[PDB]
UniProtKB/Swiss-Prot annotation, chains A, B:
Residues the record lists as N6-acetyllysine modifications: 5, 10, 143, 203, 231, 240, 259, 537, 602
Modified residues (Phosphothreonine): 286
Name the UniProt record assigns to this protein: Transketolase
EC number: 2.2.1.1
Protein source organism: Homo sapiens (Human)
Catalytic activity: D-sedoheptulose 7-phosphate + D-glyceraldehyde 3-phosphate = aldehydo-D-ribose 5-phosphate + D-xylulose 5-phosphate
Cofactor binding summary note: Binds 1 Mg(2+) ion per subunit. Can also utilize other divalent metal cations, such as Ca(2+), Mn(2+) and Co(2+).
Family indicated by similarity: Belongs to the transketolase family.
Length: 620, 620
């Protein structure tokens, strides 16, 4: 469609709209007693032009799949986001004054309980990554006409994650993506490093492969024109603005970030801004081209049961790749992402079978998680991202925000624990159980064999929230029948007798070490019950306690993870106070080192001999 | 100090050295059966020229404070780092063959148990930030002549944290820092995005303010010359190389990352490389200018006791800023770092009193932690970095690697929990105790008032490892006398009696809500013991159990944190199986929302009324 070059009356209406947005931002933050009106005011023309000239969307159906997407990366400007959606007619105007109240959903930073918000923002530097996932989806998966617009602050651009997204967008030719940089010179507590050196912002964007246009960010005409031209590259509109634009005495001043105007001042300033507004008549939003395809919502099932064989040896990292590739034959919704580790995580198998649905994210875990979050918005895809579990610590804030965003993403982290051997601790995940258990919408799968891994992949695909699958490097035996039934929150007793002395809880390599310990102990006429949790979160407290009650109330938990936040603390928290129950915990007590896998399990006290000694100790 | 322009015999010796380094990297990785010889071989001329032409260091004293610093950011090239230290005469040549053995300290990636290693690397993209800390220290604190050199991979440059470091270096004019980029075209599992588009690497480095020089990375002469000119800017040596350089048939080939040569192949290739070496005579290292100052190692003590009075009200975040500024008057080694949040964390108090020792890191938490790690190397400074606790999740991998680096850094995270109120969950730390408790060298301080905060700052300054101080936004009353003695691992019973029915454990805001609950329960003739842990890690289990035994074995924990990995799980894990002890937990069960602080404590079940109700329920 052709650009509609606005006339002076449309330009004036956009100016009027921007000033209404300023007034509302001040009124709401003054009513709340907190917030960021100066951060809203530098963006007012940008917001007016995007919502009332450039973008195409259904004002009464913000989540419509055909709509252009807007991502407010500088989330603290939430009051102006609320104001535009009131201006567009979706949000009642009076509700704007209930900003930050416990009786309102117009919270401090945007959240998806708001229909007009796809991803929660408020941790700076993450919105552009989500926007890149939306734009990739639009161009390559939905193959639709919608565009994606993301507004960033200039302080925000100090976050490395933004530059990961900038590079992603140029690698993948996201010519449907626009980043608007609100270059208002000041951060929270000092000027932003580059201040108003517009040329350096242009050079950085261009060096990263973007088409970069410097504009007066308070000129509705310049904004209409810059947004009005599509490009063959991702486009950066580098807008020179002033913080607190339009607030006399505050515009371009320090010491005003996150400071509301006191009532008396707000009244004077609003009268001043209102005096500039020529008409009360509001501009109407313009709707989109309806060319986004239908998407299936049904549960996704593996095309057949697992085809392993009991006794065969396979590492759960390889079983994950096999299983993910298999699931991709069952549904076109499954997509896979990996950070230059596909040959190690075995996500390469999925890339070989379904290349159109694999996204190489390179060595940039923060962005990879944000891409996945963006791809999962509006349920357009079911993403599985993978790397070594250790490197998901690099993306903890993106995972944290993903839960705040009520996102449904799946993450598979390999190479857990000391059992990887010789690479040493930089590559060993020893805190990932602690990390993912602390994510409030998480489900944590720790499959112990190839069958359980395939079942975990299938279950995760159909489970809402942040699903984590912990895979392993050692080649352990298949212990489960292919037709064993698996469920979230259901553990398995893999070894039992009537005279069991202790219930030993292990997972991945430590389950197999526990089974080996059981054989050692049998020689000593000592039987142990062995339990595989399957999911660490939620934990099968009932089976754990029923097992303990059959083994003199004694539990021993053994894990290839640090002591804090892992399996043993999960078990202790579940059963503390239960009459006659005792818990012994074996875990890794300090930063490891290099050696062979079996050597390290011995050094760190979680191998078959350490388990057997613990058991012999306990019976006394 | 003048450049020594090498003669052809020196150049030939540098080539011979590079080829010896190649041979050793192959021998060691073939002996180990794992490792990254192709990643070593692209860097061999770079390593030869740095260690045997450019750098100034004491070969028998790698930690000497006057030495130039070298950071191997692409840590998986460890075997060539080990080779250069053998070439320099510090390491025995035979030990190189023990790479990755449990009997050796020549681990898979570099670690500070090696005298020649300052910071552990292995998680890509972090070395440059550590190097920036070293360089900032050298120019501004030590005010010494040493230079800092950091070798990066090209896939590694996809990490946003690298760009944060690049921007830091140019803001702070680190004209004593050199980044060497090993542009060998290939990542782990595919070509790096830019491959050999050298001009784009130059453009990106220049846009970020570096002097950028493109060289042939296999030309010892071009490397000598590029390293031999000092600049007024941080300098990037953009070296065009080939992965596996010198390994016939493997050079510039995919499918060889992290793959050792089989024995038969190693023997053939080593014979060919050896045929290229003209002399067995080794180059000697050259010592440095000894102008680094003496630094004092003594215990650091506050110049006076805290000057708070019982009953006064102060937020622990403000007490932190006051305490930090006070300690800075006590010791010259204290430095403060903050990520554009100084007005919120109150690190601005330190900046005002000791501006030369404050480092503004901008909105870039991952780099901030790496800067601190670098500043703490060789014990040159005692850093305290601060931001909101939620945003330390952005730096979890840097914190993880800091522990692998045996680093002594101090972290203060403010704005914990729902008690911050209206900003909402993006700003709320609810997983920070889980996170830091999983860091194996950590000490976790959770001060409940101003006095405890000042004592925590003092103790942290003198405590090794990763110290975390969790501060709070509500103003709560001072409950401790100024002369109260505090120690790591020692809790305090702040309310007790002979007829206590429950031991309630709270911290920060929830300690105060517990005291309020006790006044409430007094109406009901019900007495409760209240315990302040002070440190969450390590926990005073003795005092907690002694308390529980005086209160019918009953413990209730209440915390402004998620359930997993926090205070309640620490306590449960500590007492599980103790006869007669029960533990009940109150925490935050899901992603919160905006409201007034008191309304959120109420909504999420961790206020005085929730505590009292829980107590009543235990008594029945
Ligand atoms: C990763 C991360 N680190 C720190 C913060 C705290 C913070 C903010 C809170 O959302 C509201 O004050 S706003 C803010 C300053 C943002 O400055 P800019 O990006 O220049 O935006 P603005 O000038 O348009 O407000 C910080 C440092 C953050 N939100 N995220
Ligand atoms: C944050 C982070 N993400 C992923 C990895 C795994 C990894 C490595 C292991 O240390 C050794 O294989 S090396 C590696 C490839 C590095 O490629 P480059 O930076 O181009 O270096 P190189 O070509 O010089 O080897 C990856 C993806 C990593 N170490 N760190
Ligand atoms: Ca700004
Ligand atoms: Ca490379
Ligand atoms: Na899922
Ligand atoms: Na310390």
């Amino acid at each position: 469609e052709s650009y509609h070059k606005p006339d002076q009356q449309k330009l004036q209406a956009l100016k009027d709209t921007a000033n209404r947005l300023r007034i509302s931002s001040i009124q709401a933050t003054t009513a709340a007693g907190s917030g960021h009106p100066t951060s809203c005011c530098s963006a007012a023309e940008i917001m007016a032009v995007l919502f009332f000239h450039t973008m195409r969307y259904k004002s009464q159906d913000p989540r419509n799949p055909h709509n252009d997407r807007f991502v407010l990366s500088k989330g603290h400007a939430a009051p102006i986001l609320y104001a535009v959606w009131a201006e567009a007619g979706f949000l009642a105007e009076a509700e704007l004054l209930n900003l930050r109240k416990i009786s309102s959903d117009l919270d401090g930073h945007p959240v998806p309980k708001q229909a007009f918000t796809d991803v929660a923002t408020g941790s700076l530097g993450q919105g552009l990554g989500a926007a890149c996932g939306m734009a990739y989806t639009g161009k390559y998966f939905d193959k639709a006409s919608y565009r994606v617009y993301c507004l960033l602050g200039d302080g925000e651009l100090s976050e490395g994650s933004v530059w990961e997204a900038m590079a992603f967008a140029s690698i993948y030719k996201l010519d449907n993506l626009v980043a608007i940089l609100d270059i208002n010179r000041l951060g929270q507590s000092d000027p932003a490093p580059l201040q108003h050196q517009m040329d350096i912002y242009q050079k950085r964007c261009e060096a990263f492969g973007w088409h970069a246009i410097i504009v007066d960010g308070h000129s509705v005409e310049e904004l209409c024109k810059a947004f009005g031209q599509a490009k063959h590259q991702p486009t950066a509109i580098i807008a020179k603005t002033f913080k607190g634009r339009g607030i006399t005495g505050v515009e371009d001043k320090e010491s005003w970030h996150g400071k509301p105007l006191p009532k008396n001042m707000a009244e004077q300033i609003i009268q001043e801004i209102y005096s500039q507004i020529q008409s009360k008549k509001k501009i109407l939003a313009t709707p989109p081209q309806e060319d986004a395809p239908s998407v299936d919502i049904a549960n996704i099932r593996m095309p057949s049961l697992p085809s392993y064989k009991v006794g065969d040896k396979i590492a759960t990292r390889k079983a994950y790749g096999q299983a993910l590739a298999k699931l991709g034959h069952a549904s076109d919704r499954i997509i896979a992402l990996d950070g230059d580790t596909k040959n190690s995580t075995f996500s390469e198998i999925f890339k070989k079978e379904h290349p159109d649905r694999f996204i190489e994210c390179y060595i940039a875990e923060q962005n990879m998680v944000s891409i996945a979050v963006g791809c999962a918005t509006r349920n357009r895809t079911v993403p599985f991202c993978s790397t070594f579990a250790a490197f998901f610590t690099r993306a903890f804030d993106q995972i944290r925000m993903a839960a705040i965003s009520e996102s449904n993403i799946n993450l598979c982290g390999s190479h857990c624990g000391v059992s990887i051997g010789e690479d040493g601790p930089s590559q060993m995940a020893l805190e990932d159980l602690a990390m993912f258990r602390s994510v409030p919408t998480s489900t944590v799968f720790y499959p112990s064999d190839g069958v359980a891994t395939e079942k975990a992949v299938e279950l995760a695909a159909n489970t809402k929230g942040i699903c984590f699958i912990r895979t392993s490097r050692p080649e352990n035996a298949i212990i489960y029948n292919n037709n064993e039934d698996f469920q979230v929150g259901q553990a398995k007793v893999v070894l039992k007798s009537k005279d069991d002395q202790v219930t030993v809880i292990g997972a991945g390599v430590t389950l197999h070490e526990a089974l080996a310990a059981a054989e050692l102990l049998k020689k000593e006429k000592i039987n142990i019950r062995v339990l595989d949790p399957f999911t660490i979160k939620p934990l099968d407290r009932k089976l754990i306690l029923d097992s303990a009650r059959a083994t003199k109330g004694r539990i021993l938990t053994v894990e290839d993870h640090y002591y804090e936040g892992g399996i043993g603390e999960a078990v202790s928290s579940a059963v503390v106070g239960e009459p006659g129950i005792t818990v012994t915990h074996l875990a890794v007590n300090r930063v490891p080192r290099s050696g062979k896998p079996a050597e390290l399990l011995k050094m760190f006290g979680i191998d078959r001999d350490a388990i057997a000694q613990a058991v012999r100790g306990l019976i006394t």
